JSON list of C-alpha atoms in Angstrom, two decimals:
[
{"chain": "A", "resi": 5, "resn": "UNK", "atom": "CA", "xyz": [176.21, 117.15, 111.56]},
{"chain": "A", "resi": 6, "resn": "UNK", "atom": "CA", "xyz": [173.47, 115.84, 109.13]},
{"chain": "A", "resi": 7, "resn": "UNK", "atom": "CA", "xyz": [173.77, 112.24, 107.94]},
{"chain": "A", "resi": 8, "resn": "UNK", "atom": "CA", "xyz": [171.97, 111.66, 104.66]},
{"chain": "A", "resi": 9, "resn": "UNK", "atom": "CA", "xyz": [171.46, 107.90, 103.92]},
{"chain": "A", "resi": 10, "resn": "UNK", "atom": "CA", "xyz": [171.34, 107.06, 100.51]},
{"chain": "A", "resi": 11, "resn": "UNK", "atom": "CA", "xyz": [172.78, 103.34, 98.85]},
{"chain": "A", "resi": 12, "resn": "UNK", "atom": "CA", "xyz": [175.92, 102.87, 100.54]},
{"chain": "A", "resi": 13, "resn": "UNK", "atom": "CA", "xyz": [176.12, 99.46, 102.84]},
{"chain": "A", "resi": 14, "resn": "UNK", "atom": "CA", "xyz": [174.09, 100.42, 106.31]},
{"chain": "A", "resi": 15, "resn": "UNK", "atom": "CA", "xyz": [177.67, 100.05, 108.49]},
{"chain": "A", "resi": 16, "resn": "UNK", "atom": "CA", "xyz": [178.95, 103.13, 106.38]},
{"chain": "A", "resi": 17, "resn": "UNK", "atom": "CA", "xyz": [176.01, 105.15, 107.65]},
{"chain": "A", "resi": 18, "resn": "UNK", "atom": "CA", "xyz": [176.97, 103.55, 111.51]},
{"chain": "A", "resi": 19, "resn": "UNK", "atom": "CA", "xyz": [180.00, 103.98, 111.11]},
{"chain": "A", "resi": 20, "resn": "UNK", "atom": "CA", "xyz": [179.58, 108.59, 109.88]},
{"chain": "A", "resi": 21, "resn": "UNK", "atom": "CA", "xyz": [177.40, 108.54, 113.12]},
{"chain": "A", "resi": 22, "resn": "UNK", "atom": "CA", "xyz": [179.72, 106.91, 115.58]},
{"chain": "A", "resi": 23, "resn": "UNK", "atom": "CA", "xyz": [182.92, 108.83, 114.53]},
{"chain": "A", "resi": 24, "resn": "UNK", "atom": "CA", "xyz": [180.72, 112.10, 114.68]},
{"chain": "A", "resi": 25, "resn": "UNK", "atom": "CA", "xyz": [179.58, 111.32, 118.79]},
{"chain": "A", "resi": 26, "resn": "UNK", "atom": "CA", "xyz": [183.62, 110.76, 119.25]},
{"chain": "A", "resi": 27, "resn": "UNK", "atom": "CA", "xyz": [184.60, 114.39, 118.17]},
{"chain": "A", "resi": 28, "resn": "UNK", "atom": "CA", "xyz": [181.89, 115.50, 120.50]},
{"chain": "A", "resi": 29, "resn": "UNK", "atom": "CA", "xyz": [179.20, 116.85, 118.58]},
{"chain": "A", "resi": 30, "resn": "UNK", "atom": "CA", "xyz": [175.90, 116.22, 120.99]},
{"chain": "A", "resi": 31, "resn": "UNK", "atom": "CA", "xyz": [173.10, 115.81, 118.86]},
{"chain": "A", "resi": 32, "resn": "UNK", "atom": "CA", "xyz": [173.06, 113.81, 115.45]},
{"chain": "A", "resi": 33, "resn": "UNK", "atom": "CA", "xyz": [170.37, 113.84, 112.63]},
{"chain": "A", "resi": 34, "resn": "UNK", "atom": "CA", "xyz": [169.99, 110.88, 110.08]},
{"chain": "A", "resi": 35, "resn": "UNK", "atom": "CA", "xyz": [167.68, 111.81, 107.78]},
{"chain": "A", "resi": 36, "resn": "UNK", "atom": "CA", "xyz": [166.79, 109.66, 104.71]},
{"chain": "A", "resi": 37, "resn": "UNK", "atom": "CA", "xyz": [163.81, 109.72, 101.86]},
{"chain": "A", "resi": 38, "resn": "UNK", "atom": "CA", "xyz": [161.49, 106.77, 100.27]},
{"chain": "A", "resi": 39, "resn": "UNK", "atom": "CA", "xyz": [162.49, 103.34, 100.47]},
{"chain": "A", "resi": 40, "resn": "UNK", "atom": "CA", "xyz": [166.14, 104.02, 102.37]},
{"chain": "A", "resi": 41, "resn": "UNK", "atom": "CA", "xyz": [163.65, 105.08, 105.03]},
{"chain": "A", "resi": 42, "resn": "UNK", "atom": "CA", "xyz": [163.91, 101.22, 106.35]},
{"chain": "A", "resi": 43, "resn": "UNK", "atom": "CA", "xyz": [167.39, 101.63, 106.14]},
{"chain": "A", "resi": 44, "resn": "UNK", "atom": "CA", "xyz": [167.45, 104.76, 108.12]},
{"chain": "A", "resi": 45, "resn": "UNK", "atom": "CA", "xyz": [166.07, 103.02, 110.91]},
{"chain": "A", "resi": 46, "resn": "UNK", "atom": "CA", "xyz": [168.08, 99.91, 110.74]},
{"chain": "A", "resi": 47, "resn": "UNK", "atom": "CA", "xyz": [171.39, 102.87, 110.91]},
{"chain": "A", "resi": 48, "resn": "UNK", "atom": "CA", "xyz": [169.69, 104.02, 114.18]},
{"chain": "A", "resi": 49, "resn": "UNK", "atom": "CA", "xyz": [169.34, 101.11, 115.88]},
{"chain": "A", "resi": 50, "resn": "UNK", "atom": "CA", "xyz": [172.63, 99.31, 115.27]},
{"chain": "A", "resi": 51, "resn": "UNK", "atom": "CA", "xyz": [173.77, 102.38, 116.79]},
{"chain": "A", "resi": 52, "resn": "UNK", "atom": "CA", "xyz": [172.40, 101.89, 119.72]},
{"chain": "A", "resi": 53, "resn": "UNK", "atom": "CA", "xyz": [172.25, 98.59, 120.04]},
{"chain": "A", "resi": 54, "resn": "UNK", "atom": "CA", "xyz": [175.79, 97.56, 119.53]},
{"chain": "A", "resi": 55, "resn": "UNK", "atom": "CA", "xyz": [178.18, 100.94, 119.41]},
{"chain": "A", "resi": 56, "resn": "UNK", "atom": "CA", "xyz": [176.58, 103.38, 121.25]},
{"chain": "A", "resi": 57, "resn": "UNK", "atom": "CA", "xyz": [174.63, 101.57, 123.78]},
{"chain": "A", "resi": 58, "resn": "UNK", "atom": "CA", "xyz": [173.63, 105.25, 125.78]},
{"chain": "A", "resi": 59, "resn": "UNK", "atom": "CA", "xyz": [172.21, 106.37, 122.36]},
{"chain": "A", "resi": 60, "resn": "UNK", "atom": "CA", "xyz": [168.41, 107.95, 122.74]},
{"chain": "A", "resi": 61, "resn": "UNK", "atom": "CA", "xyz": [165.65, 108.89, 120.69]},
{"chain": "A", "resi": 62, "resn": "UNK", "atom": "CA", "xyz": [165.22, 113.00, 120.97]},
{"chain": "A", "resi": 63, "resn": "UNK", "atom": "CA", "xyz": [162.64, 113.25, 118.37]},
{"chain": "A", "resi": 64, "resn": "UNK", "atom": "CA", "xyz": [161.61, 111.71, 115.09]},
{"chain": "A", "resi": 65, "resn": "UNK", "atom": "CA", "xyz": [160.21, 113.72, 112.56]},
{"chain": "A", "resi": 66, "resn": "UNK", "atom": "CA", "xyz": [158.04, 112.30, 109.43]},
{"chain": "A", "resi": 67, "resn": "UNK", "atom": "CA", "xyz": [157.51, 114.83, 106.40]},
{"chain": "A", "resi": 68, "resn": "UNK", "atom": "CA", "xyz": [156.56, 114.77, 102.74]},
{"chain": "A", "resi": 69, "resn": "UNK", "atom": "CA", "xyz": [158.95, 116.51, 100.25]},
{"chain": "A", "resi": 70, "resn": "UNK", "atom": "CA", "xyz": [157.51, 117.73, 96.77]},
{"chain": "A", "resi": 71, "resn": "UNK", "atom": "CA", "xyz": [159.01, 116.17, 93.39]},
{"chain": "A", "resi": 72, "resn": "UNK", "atom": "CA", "xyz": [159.39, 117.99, 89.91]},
{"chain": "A", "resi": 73, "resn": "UNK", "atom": "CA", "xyz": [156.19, 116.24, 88.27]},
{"chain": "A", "resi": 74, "resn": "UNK", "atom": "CA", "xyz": [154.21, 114.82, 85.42]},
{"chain": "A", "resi": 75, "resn": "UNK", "atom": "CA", "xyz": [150.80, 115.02, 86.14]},
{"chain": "A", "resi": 76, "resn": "UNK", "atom": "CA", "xyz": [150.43, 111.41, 87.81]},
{"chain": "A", "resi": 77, "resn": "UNK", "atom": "CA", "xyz": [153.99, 111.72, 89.02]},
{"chain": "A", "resi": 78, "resn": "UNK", "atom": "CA", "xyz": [154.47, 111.14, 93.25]},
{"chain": "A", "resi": 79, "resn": "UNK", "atom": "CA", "xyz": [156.02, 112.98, 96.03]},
{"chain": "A", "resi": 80, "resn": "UNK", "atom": "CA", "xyz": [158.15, 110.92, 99.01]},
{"chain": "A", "resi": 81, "resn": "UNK", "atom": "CA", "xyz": [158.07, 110.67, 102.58]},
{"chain": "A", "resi": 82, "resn": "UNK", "atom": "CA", "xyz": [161.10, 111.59, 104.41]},
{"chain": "A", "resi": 83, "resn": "UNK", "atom": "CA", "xyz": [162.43, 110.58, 108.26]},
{"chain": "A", "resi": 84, "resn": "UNK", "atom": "CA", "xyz": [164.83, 112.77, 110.54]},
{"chain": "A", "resi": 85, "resn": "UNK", "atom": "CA", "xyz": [166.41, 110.89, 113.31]},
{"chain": "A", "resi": 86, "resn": "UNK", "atom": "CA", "xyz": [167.32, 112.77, 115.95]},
{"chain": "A", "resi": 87, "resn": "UNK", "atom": "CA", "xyz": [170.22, 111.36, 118.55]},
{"chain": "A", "resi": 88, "resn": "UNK", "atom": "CA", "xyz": [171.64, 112.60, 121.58]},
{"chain": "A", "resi": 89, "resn": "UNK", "atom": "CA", "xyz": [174.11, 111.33, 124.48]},
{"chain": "B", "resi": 5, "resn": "UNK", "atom": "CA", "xyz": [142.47, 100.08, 116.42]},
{"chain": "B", "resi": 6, "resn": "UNK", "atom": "CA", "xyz": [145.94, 98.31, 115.56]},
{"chain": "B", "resi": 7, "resn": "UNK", "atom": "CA", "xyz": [146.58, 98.43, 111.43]},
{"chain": "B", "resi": 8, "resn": "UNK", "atom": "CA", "xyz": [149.66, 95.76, 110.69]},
{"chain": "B", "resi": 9, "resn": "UNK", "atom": "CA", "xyz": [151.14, 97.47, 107.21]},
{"chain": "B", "resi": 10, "resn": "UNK", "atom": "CA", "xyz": [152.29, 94.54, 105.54]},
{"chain": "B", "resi": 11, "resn": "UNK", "atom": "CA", "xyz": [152.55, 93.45, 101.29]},
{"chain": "B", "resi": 12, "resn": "UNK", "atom": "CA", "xyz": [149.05, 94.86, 100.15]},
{"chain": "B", "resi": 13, "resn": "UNK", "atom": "CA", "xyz": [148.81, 98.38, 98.30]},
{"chain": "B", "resi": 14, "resn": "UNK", "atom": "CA", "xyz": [149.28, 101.84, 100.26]},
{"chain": "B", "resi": 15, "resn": "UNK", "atom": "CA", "xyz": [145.46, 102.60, 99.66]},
{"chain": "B", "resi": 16, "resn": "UNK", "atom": "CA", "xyz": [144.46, 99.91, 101.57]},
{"chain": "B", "resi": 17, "resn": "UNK", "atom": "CA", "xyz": [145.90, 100.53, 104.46]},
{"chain": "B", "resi": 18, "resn": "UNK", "atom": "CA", "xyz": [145.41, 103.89, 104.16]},
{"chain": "B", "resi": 19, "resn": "UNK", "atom": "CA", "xyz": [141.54, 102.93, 103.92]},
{"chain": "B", "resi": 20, "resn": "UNK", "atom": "CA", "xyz": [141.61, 100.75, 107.23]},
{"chain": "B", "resi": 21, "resn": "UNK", "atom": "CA", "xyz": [142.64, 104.43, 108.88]},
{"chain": "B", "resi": 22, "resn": "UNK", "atom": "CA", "xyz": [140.21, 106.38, 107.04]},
{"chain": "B", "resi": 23, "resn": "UNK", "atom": "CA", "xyz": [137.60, 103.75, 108.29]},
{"chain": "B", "resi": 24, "resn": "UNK", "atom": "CA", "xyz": [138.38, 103.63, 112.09]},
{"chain": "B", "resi": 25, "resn": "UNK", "atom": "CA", "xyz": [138.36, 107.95, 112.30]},
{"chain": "B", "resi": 26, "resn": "UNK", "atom": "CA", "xyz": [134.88, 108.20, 110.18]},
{"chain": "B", "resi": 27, "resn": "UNK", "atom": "CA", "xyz": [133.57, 105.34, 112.83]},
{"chain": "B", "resi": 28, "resn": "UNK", "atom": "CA", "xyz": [134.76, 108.45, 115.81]},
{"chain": "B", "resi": 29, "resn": "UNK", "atom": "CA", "xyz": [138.27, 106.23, 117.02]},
{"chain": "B", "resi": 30, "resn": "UNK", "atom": "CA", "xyz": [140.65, 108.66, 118.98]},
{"chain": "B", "resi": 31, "resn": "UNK", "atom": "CA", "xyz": [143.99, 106.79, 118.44]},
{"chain": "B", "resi": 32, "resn": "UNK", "atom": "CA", "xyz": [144.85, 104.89, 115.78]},
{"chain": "B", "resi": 33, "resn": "UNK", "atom": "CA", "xyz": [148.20, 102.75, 115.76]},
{"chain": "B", "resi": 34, "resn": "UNK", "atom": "CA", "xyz": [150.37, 101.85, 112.34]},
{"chain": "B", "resi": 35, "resn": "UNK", "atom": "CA", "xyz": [152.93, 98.35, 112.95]},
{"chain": "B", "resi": 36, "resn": "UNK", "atom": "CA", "xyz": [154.98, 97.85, 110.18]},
{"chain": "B", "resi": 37, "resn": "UNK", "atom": "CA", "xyz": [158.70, 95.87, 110.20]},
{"chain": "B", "resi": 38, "resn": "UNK", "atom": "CA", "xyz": [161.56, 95.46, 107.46]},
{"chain": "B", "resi": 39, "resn": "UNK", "atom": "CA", "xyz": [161.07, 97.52, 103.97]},
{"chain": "B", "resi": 40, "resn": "UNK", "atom": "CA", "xyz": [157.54, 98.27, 104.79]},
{"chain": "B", "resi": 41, "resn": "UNK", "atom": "CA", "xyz": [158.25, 100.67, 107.58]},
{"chain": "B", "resi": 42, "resn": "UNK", "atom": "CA", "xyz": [158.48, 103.32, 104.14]},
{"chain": "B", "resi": 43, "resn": "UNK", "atom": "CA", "xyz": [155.34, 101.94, 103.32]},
{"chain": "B", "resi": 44, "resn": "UNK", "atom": "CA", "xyz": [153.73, 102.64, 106.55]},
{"chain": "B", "resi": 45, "resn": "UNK", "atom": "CA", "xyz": [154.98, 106.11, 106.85]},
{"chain": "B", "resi": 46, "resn": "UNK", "atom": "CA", "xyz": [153.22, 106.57, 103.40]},
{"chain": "B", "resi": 47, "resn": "UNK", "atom": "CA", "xyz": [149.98, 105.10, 104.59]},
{"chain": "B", "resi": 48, "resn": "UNK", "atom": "CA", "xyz": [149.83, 108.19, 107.65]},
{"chain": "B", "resi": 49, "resn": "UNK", "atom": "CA", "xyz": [151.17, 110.92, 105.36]},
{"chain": "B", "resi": 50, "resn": "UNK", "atom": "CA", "xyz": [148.46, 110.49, 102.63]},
{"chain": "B", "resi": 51, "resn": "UNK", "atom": "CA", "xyz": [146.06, 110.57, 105.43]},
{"chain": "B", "resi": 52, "resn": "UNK", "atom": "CA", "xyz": [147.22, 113.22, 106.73]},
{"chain": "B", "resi": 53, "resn": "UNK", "atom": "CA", "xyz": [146.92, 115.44, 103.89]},
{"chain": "B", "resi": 54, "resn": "UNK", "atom": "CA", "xyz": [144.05, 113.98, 101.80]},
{"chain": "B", "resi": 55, "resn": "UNK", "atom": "CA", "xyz": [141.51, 112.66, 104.49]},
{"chain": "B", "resi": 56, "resn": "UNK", "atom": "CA", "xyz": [141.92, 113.36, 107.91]},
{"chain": "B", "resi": 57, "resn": "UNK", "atom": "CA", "xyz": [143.89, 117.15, 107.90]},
{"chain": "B", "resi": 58, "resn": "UNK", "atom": "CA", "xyz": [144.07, 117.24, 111.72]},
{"chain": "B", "resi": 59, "resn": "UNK", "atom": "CA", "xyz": [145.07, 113.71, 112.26]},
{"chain": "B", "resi": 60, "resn": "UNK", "atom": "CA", "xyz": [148.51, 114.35, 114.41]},
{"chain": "B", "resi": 61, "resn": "UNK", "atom": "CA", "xyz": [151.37, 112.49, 115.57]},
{"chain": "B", "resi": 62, "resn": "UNK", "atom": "CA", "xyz": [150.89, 111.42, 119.01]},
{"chain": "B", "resi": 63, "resn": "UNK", "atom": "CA", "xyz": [153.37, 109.35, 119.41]},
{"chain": "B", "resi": 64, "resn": "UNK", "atom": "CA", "xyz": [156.40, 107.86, 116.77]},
{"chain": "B", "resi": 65, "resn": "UNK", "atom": "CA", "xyz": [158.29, 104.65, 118.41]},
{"chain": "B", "resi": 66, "resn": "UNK", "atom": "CA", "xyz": [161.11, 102.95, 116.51]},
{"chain": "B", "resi": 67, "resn": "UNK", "atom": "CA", "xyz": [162.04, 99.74, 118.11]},
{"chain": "B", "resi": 68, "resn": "UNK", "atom": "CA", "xyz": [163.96, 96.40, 116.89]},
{"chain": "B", "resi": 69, "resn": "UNK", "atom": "CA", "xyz": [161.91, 92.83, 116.56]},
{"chain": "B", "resi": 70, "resn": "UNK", "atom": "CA", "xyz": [163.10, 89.17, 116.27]},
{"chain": "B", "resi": 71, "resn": "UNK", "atom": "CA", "xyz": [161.54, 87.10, 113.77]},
{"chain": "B", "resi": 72, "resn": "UNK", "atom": "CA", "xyz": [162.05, 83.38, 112.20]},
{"chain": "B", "resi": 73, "resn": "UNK", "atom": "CA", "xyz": [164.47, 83.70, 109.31]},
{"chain": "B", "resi": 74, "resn": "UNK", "atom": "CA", "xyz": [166.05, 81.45, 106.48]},
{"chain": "B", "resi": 75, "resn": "UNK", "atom": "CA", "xyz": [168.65, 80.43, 108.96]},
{"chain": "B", "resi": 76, "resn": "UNK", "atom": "CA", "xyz": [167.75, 80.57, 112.62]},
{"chain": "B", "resi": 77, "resn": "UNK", "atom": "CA", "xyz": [166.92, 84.37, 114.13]},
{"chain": "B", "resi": 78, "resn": "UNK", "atom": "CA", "xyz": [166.48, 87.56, 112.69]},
{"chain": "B", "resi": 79, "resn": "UNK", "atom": "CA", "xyz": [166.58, 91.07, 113.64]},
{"chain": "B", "resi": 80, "resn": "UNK", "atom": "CA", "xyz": [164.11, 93.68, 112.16]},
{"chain": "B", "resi": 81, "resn": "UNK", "atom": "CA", "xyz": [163.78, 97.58, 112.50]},
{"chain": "B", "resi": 82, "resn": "UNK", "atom": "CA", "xyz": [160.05, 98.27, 113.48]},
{"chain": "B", "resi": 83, "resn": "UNK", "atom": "CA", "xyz": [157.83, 101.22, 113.65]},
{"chain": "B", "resi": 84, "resn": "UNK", "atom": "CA", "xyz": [155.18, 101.70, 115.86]},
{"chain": "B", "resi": 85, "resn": "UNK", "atom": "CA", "xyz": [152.96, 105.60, 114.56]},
{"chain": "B", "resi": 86, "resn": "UNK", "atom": "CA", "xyz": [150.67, 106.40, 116.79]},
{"chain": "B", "resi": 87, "resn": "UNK", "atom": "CA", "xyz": [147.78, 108.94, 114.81]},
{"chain": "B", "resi": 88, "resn": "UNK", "atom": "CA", "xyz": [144.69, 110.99, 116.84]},
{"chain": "B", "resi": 89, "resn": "UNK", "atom": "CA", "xyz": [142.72, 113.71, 117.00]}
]
């Protein structure tokens, strides 16, 4: 029920989201990490902007998540989506 | 009290924040639009957990914006972060 968006072209990501709300699961999560973050969003609101126009927000959660370092090296924010109805 | 994260470094953006809660501001809002929405979700996490540790979440808005492209219109995600204490 968790859509993780990595590098595949945004309608893909739409398109996991839409067919999941058709087998009747009520709640989906799109959760994505670091620069896809953008694209997250842009998955979200397609959604509800042109397939499923009763789509709404339940929460959004931002996070940091920890990375196997060098000393210097960074850690990345992170976005879950949440959608319902 | 409105901080537009746009194409200069994290830091300094994270540095108009730190700014407006040393000079005692309740609510602080983040803009950003396009690829820089990751950028802006960088700029509250680092202040979050290196300057201001009970800066919270009061409010996360995702919307969609309309902007002058190459060719005619242009639809951008856009995140609105609202920070306080």
């Amino acid at each position: 029920n968790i859509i993780f968006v990595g590098k595949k072209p945004t309608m893909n990501y739409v398109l996991a989201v839409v067919t999941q709300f058709n087998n009747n699961a009520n709640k989906i999560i799109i959760k994505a990490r670091g620069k896809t973050i953008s694209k997250a969003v842009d998955v979200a609101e397609i959604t509800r902007h042109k397939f499923i126009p009763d789509a709404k927000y339940e929460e959004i959660r931002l996070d940091t998540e920890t990375l196997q370092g060098e000393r210097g090296s960074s850690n990345v924010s992170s976005i879950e989506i949440t959608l319902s109805r």
